[PDB]
Amino acid sequence: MENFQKVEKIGEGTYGVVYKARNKLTGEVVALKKIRSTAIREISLLKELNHPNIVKLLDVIHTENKLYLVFEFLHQDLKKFMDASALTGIPLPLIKSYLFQLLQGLAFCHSHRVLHRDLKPQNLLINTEGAIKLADFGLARAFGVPVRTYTHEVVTLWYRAPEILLGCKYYSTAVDIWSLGCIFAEMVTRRALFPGDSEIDQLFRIFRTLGTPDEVVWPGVTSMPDYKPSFPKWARQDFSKVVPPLDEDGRSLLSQMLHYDPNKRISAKAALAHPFFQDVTKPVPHL
Numbered sequence: 301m302e303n304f305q306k307v308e309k310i311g312e313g314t315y316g317v318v319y320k321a322r323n324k325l326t327g328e329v330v331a332l333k334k335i336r337s338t339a340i341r342e343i344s345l346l347k348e349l350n351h352p353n354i355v356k357l358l359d360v361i362h363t364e365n366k367l368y369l370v371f372e373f374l375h376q377d378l379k380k381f382m383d384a385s386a387l388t389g390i391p392l393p394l395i396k397s398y399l400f401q402l403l404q405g406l407a408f409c410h411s412h413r414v415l416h417r418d419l420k421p422q423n424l425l426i427n428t429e430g431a432i433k434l435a436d437f438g439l440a441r442a443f444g445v446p447v448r449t450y451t452h453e454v455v456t457l458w459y460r461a462p463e464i465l466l467g468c469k470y471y472s473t474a475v476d477i478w479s480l481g482c483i484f485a486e487m488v489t490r491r492a493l494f495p496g497d498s499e500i501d502q503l504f505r506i507f508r509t510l511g512t513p514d515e516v517v518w519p520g521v522t523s524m525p526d527y528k529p530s531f532p533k534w535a536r537q538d539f540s541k542v543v544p545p546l547d548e549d550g551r552s553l554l555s556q557m558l559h560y561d562p563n564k565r566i567s568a569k570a571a572l573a574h575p576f577f578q579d580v581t582k583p584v585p586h587l
């Protein structure tokens with residue numbers, strides 16, 4: 301915080317404000333997150349979790365009852381890009397490139413047993429080169445995911461996996477695959493897949509599209525903490541209706557990313573080998 305000159309406020313994260321700043325000694329431009337022992341060790345360990353598709357955590361500065369996290373700076377988030385592309389839509393080749401890169405980032409972190417747990421358009425960052433990176437990876441394990449952010453904003457439930465909503469205490473890396481699948485669908489259709497406004501609304505929106513889960517598709521689901529036998533029983537919808545005009549390879553992949561059973565849900569590694577990526581390229585984004 302000493303060798304940092306604030307340039308401007310970038311926005312507000314889940315835990316603290318984020319500024320674009322310059323290292324007063326190295327001139328390095330960074331994203332500085334300001335948050336007002338176990339958490340410190342946990343976060344400090346993230347400095348070694350480096351990958352091209354993960355926003356680099358340069359440093360962790362604990363001083364004066366404040367925690368500063370210094371990140372590599374990216375010029376924009378995916379949310380802004382999706383909104384700017386609302387009328388025309390993000391070209392499929394670019395959507396495929398982004399999904400491909402995000403899966404590489406997940407595969408890396410998951411190989412080290414680190415999960416994100418709260419993936420959303422606001423923490424997926426992009427540059428003018430065509431790269432996309434995941435930000436805030438690992439912070440959920442250290443701080444937890446609150447109901448409201450430090451500014452009292454509601455933490456979105458739109459990308460939350462069903463096992464979390466049903467009360468599972470030990471989530472797995474599968475929770476991130478679910479979130480990414482929801483984001484994938486959103487990029488394709490230009491509308492959130494499951495825009496719930498409460499935990500039950502979120503759960504029922506999922507149920508209405510994918511069908512109410514039962515022991516057939518998800519062994520043990522009826523014994524989960526928040527599962528209720530009184531849940532309405534909705535029939536599953538054809539994905540052809542859920543994400544048109546995505547082709548069959550894309551629908552196949554999305555379906556596997558949205559499997560109810562965390563055990564059946566495709567892994568990031570397996571997803572990277574899916575036929576959908578056979579013709580993947582790296583386009584330069586227009587905006």
Ligand SMILES: CN(C)C[C@@H](O)COc1ccc(Nc2nccc(Nc3cc(Cl)ccc3Cl)n2)cc1
Pocket residue numbers: 310311312313314318331355371372373374375376377380422423425435436
């Ligand atoms: C209302 N409006 C100003 C909000 C958006 O446009 C905000 O646009 C931007 C513009 C640039 C960057 N770069 C960036 N680079 C590195 C880390 C990082 N972390 C981060 C930052 C915020 Cl703010 C929220 C959540 C996270 Cl995980 N952000 C991020 C968002």
